[PDB]
Write a protein that binds this DNA or RNA. Sequence first.
DNA 1: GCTTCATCCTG
DNA 2: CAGGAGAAGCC
Length: 256
Amino acid sequence: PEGPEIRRAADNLEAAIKGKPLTDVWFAFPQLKTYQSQLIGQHVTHVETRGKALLTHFSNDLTLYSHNQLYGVWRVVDTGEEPQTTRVLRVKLQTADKTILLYSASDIEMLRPEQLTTHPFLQRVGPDVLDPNLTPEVVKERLLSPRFRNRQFAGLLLDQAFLAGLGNYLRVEILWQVGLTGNHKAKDLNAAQLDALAHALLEIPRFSYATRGQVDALFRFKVFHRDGEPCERCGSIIEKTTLSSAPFYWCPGCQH
DNA sequence: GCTTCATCCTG
DNA sequence: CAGGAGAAGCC
Ligand SMILES: [Zn+2]
């Protein structure tokens, strides 16, 4: 679940309960139980995302921070209904007609304003690829800054301190799109390559967000999990190798 | 960057 | 039933 999936989730959560008075609130964690009575009657004002971090803001200035990491998942159901699953329920925010449920996630914390501005993660993450204000220009600027210009892409594209929201599938799909291997550094690219990379870093995540689900051609994986299969661009056989602690899918025939 | 955490999926 | 699929740890 990378930036695009998380924003899609957040949009569904907002459509479900944004602005509606909470009729019941439940948290699995003992440390969060105290907030149950405090939030009943309040309402979610908006669901903000920063990369894969999701922030559910409430009308009393509290904010529930949740990060699904590799296994958390939200579900929208009609109030009263309980999904058929073996997953562990961690949060229930219920309104008159709709209820949202967070399953499996382990990183869940209730934040006060002071904790928001200085949260370790929220404080170290870089600009969000889904942020409309972020442009290819600013992205190029970032890639060439002394801070990132010498970083190999294999690790850079997974680092949320560079651009928030990029995960392993976006990492491999972006690099394949621009024909680059994971060992490249922004400082060694020619102007044409840097431009393509800069645009792809924003356009692919935004394309997945807009079309992988919901919609309104369609996003699809070109190399992610297609190792052993022929590249649709050059026909070479896609390979898989571990780079920066995550499986790197790439085509030796058109990625250089 | 390497290892550990943490939950569900998979060979 | 290992260990594969995004952090925090360890600072
Ligand atoms: Zn190819």
